Design a protein around this ligand. Structure first.
Ligand SMILES: N=C(N)NCCC[C@H](N)C(=O)N1CCN(C(=O)N2CCC[C@H](C(=O)Nc3ccc(Cl)c(F)c3)C2)CC1
Ligand SMILES: *[C@@H]1O[C@H](CO)[C@@H](O)[C@H](O)[C@H]1NC(C)=O
Ligand SMILES: *[C@@H]1O[C@H](CO)[C@@H](O)[C@H](O)[C@H]1NC(C)=O
Ligand SMILES: *[C@@H]1O[C@H](CO)[C@@H](O)[C@H](O)[C@H]1NC(C)=O
Ligand SMILES: *[C@@H]1O[C@H](CO)[C@@H](O)[C@H](O)[C@H]1NC(C)=O
Ligand SMILES: *[C@@H]1O[C@H](CO)[C@@H](O)[C@H](O)[C@H]1NC(C)=O
Ligand SMILES: *[C@@H]1O[C@H](CO)[C@@H](O)[C@H](O)[C@H]1NC(C)=O
Ligand SMILES: *[C@@H]1O[C@H](CO)[C@@H](O)[C@H](O)[C@H]1NC(C)=O
Ligand SMILES: *[C@@H]1O[C@H](CO)[C@@H](O)[C@H](O)[C@H]1NC(C)=O
Ligand SMILES: *[C@@H]1O[C@H](CO)[C@@H](O)[C@H](O)[C@H]1NC(C)=O
Length: 339
């Protein structure tokens, strides 16, 4: 017997107590070892409601990653609130590791194992777990990287699809590689290579999934209509360096177009931080070939408003609220109290 409750979670990780990589160092002192003997408990014939868009776990992971980056990804200068601060900003080792979220005694985590679960409402195949699986805290905009994949079809997630202000999380069932490189020896110029055959296939499937939700209306993709570079570009951290990649070549409805898509990128030093209002300034990039090969496993989308008297729905890549990133992996969990 249980009821919906919120409590203070703890984390578990396979961090190596030697590694200087920042998530390992943080997980070494802020998390416990992962359960070596985990065993979920099926809740035979239990139907339970979930809400990924209203889930305290997401906020608790958000505070962790805020704490993690604050302890690890230190800018030389922060302009937080007008009170500029010039501190140490050594170049670090940065490569996200899986974090597990675990309940204390007297609570458990209910896990939705419905393969088509969209994030909100009833789940019919519920199990109980002590900890989540290992979630990589990958910070990004527009494209969700290195996540899990949807088990069956492409899943559309939104608190309310009808509300255009509510962000859409596309959970892909097939990952699309994105290979980003700042070549060795304009030291901020970089590029991400994406196989255009794969991407346009997956994007076409996304259009067709979106059609099912929008009355078979014409689905149009467009670049973001204004905003900061972090969200108008596909932003992410690669080996400590902030990459900003132009995805206009991705979010065109063009598709003699199917070779390698090369996105122009810039490594940016002055960041509009995702943690909270503030610009952070980092050092110029490290030397050498800076390369991150990531799986695109999700897309963050915002649907244009004022199209109800038209035949089209236009979608633009979104992001900025990293809670939606954690939400994209935490969606099948929810904390309950042992009543
Ligand atoms: N109880 C509640 N429900 N509270 C609501 C929470 C809102 C949240 N606390 C908040 O204040 N917030 C500050 C304003 N925020 C912003 O203004 N922006 C606009 C500028 C860019 C930012 C970007 O995404 N930066 C970025 C940087 C590096 C990388 Cl690698 C990357 F992928 C992305 C996003 C964020 C949330
Ligand atoms: C429920 O999920 C389990 C994994 O926990 C898996 O065997 C299958 O997808 C589902 N099985 C039943 C009997 O519902
Ligand atoms: C998710 O599924 C539930 C089923 O109860 C439904 O009410 C809700 O509208 C669905 N959301 C989306 C975005 O499809
Ligand atoms: C990338 O995707 C492949 C298959 O889609 C998967 O086997 C691999 O584990 C993924 N890599 C990472 C780092 O998640
Ligand atoms: C992914 O989902 C789409 C529907 O959204 C489906 O047509 C396609 O076959 C799926 N691919 C895989 C590998 O499951
Ligand atoms: C979904 O959003 C629309 C648009 O504002 C709103 O009219 C509707 O009431 C919302 N649905 C729910 C369940 O809140
Ligand atoms: C990534 O791109 C670089 C530069 O084009 C290339 O040398 C490397 O082989 C690529 N790696 C993968 C896994 O595609
Ligand atoms: C691009 O993707 C298609 C389909 O997945 C594949 O057949 C092709 O080999 C890929 N191209 C390259 C250059 O890897
Ligand atoms: C991305 O590139 C396109 C085409 O070159 C350009 O029109 C657009 O302004 C670029 N995006 C940004 C945010 O500058
Ligand atoms: C995604 O995972 C791969 C393999 O672990 C890693 O090389 C890459 O840097 C990761 N990408 C990001 C953005 O963390």
């Amino acid at each position: 017997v249980w009821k919906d409750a919120d409590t203070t979670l703890f984390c578990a990780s396979d961090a190596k107590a030697y590694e200087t990589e920042v998530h390992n160092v943080w997980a070494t002192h802020a998390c416990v070892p992962t359960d070596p003997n985990p065993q979920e408990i099926h809740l035979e014939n239990v139907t339970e409601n979930f809400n990924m868009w209203k889930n305290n776990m997401v906020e608790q992971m958000h505070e962790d990653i805020i704490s993690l980056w604050d302890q690890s990804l230190q800018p030389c200068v922060k302009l937080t609130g007008g009170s500029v601060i010039k501190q140490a900003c050594p170049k670090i080792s940065f490569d996200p590791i899986p974090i597990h979220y675990c309940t204390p005694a007297g609570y458990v985590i209910l896990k939705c194992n419905d393969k088509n679960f969209n994030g909100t409402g009833p789940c019919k195949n519920v199990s109980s777990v002590q900890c989540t699986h290992g979630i990589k805290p990958v910070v990004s905009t527009q494209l969700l990287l290195n996540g899990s994949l949807a088990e069956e079809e492409i899943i559309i997630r939104s608190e309310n699809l009808t509300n255009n202000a509510k962000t859409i999380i596309v959970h892909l069932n097939k990952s699309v590689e994105i290979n980003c490189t700042r070549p060795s020896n304009d030291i901020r110029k970089a590029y991400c290579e994406i196989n255009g055959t794969k991407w346009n296939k997956v994007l076409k499937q996304v259009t067709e999934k979106l059609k099912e939700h929008f009355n078979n209306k014409t689905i149009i993709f467009q670049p973001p209509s204004g905003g900061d570079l972090e969200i108008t570009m596909h932003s992410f951290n690669c080996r400590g360096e902030f990459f900003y990649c132009n995805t206009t070549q991705l979010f065109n409805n063009t598709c003699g177009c199917n070779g390698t898509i090369t996105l122009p990128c810039k490594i940016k030093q002055i960041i509009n931080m995702w943690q909270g209002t503030g610009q952070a300034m980092y050092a110029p990039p490290i030397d050498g070939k800076i390369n991150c090969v990531s799986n695109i496993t999700g897309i963050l989308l915002t649907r244009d408003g004022g199209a109800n008297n038209t035949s089209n729905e236009t979608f633009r890549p979104g992001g900025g609220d990293m809670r939606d990133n954690w939400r994209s992996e935490l969606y099948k969990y929810k904390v309950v109290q042992i009543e």
